[PDB]
């Protein structure tokens, strides 16, 4: 093969940390490769999180991070799509679509109820991506935060 | 120590009584009552490494509970808590059980150096909105679901 979407491994973390650090910069964080790599390795070692990466000609182009959720009402599990990012050079080539296609197949393999996520209301690009992938906008619930 | 009311972490010994309230909570969200199913799933959540249950006991009766679980913020490279489920049985409502449960959840999250406590509640749940606003919670993001 020449392109692949697959689960991340320890061997990928050094290159993946660069993209994870770029993703943090998109949301306003200052670049800090040491901090980004440390936290990426903490999430990678956690049993309930799943990383898929898209590789094209041995370069990581993007990633998706999911984690297990529990629904008390249904008495079943689901997945939360927490982070999705494709590096600018590789955008608009289907990397995010392929990453989400794999996340959907993975969630079906795990008999998940659904994949849920939250994205900024003003993030035009992400809304179009999610709608293309079969996600439905839902405003039944309201989020609240207690800042500590 | 001598006390008559307490908010404390749940133990295996509390699960049989706690399952009654957990079953009522599931019925609040539309599920059919099934004590066996509710208890089985409550025990599965209790056995998740990052889940934290607090229960409120008044005169040896469990009046209510809160269930929190660990969240990871990739942007901040830090952890936070999600307040997933909150419930007080009707006989004990409007006595401060939920306020006391959330007061303890806040102290617990501060002990763990969490960034915040976040939650989602139904947009039509006017009682919960008043509770969360009283406790210091604040109402930018849109939820999407893929039902697989
Ligand atoms: C819940 C969360 O975690 S939200 C996190 C959202 N992530 C971000 O916004 C990070 C910054 N942005 C990015 O990394 C990227 O632009 C992404 C992830 C949004 C898209 O990655 P890409 O690989 O470029 O997307 P891909 O090429 O697979 O596009 C698939 C669909 O997404 C939509 N889309 C992607 N980019 C755009 C864009 N710039 N404008 C409009 N729609 C877009 C389209 O529907 C597109 O289908 P199409 O090309 O046939 O029209
Ligand atoms: C919401 C709920 C947890 C409140 O529990 P509670 O122990 O009765 O609440 P408290 O007595 O601690 O009340 C604290 C504050 O919440 C608000 N509140 C609680 N019940 C309310 C009601 N029926 N109407 C309006 N405000 C209400 C008020 O701000 C109240 O402060 P006040 O009594 O000084 O005015 C309870 O009604 C419940 O279990 N409801 C069903 C499940 C649910 O909605 N859970 C939350 C979503 S998971
Ligand atoms: Br490879
Ligand atoms: Br992984
Ligand atoms: Br659900
Ligand atoms: Br494609
Ligand atoms: Br897999
Ligand atoms: Br569902
Ligand atoms: Br966003
Ligand atoms: Br006790
Ligand atoms: Br125990
Ligand atoms: Br026991
Ligand atoms: Br109820
Ligand atoms: Br849990
Ligand atoms: Br009493
Ligand atoms: Br007593
Ligand atoms: Br009891
Ligand atoms: Br504790
Ligand atoms: Br925060
Ligand atoms: Br508010
Ligand atoms: Mg949940
Ligand atoms: Mg997160
Ligand atoms: Na660090
Ligand atoms: Na930040």
Numbering used by the authors:
A (entry chain B): -1 to 146
B (entry chain A): -3 to 135, 138 to 146
Question: What do the authors of the reporting publication say about this deposited model?
Answer:
In this study, we have found a downstream regulatory element in this pathway: the polyamine acetyltransferase Dpa that specifically acetylates 1,3-DAP in A. baumannii to control the effective levels of the metabolite. The structure of Dpa revealed a dimeric architecture with a conserved acCoA and an acidic polyamine binding site formed at the dimer interface that shares properties with other polyamine acetyltransferases.
To better understand its structure-function interplay, we determined the structure of Dpa bound to acCoA. Dpa had an overall topology common to GNAT family acetyltransferases. Unlike SpeG acetyltransferases that form higher oligomers, Dpa formed a dimer through a C-terminal β-strand swap. The acidic nature of the channel likely facilitated the access of basic polyamines into the reaction center. The dimensions of the β-swap channel contiguous to the constricted reaction center likely favored the specificity of Dpa for the smaller 1,3-DAP polyamine. By contrast, in Dpa, Aac(6’)-Iy and PaiA the phosphoadenosine is docked entirely against α-helix α6 due to the divergent sequence of the P-loop, where the first residue in canonic [GxGx(A/G)] motif G is substituted by a large and charged reside. The large R90 sidechain in Dpa pushes the adenosine moiety against the α6 α-helix. In Dpa, like in SSATs, a swapped dimer is formed by the β-strand exchange, while bacterial SpeG-like enzymes adopt large torus-shaped oligomeric structures.
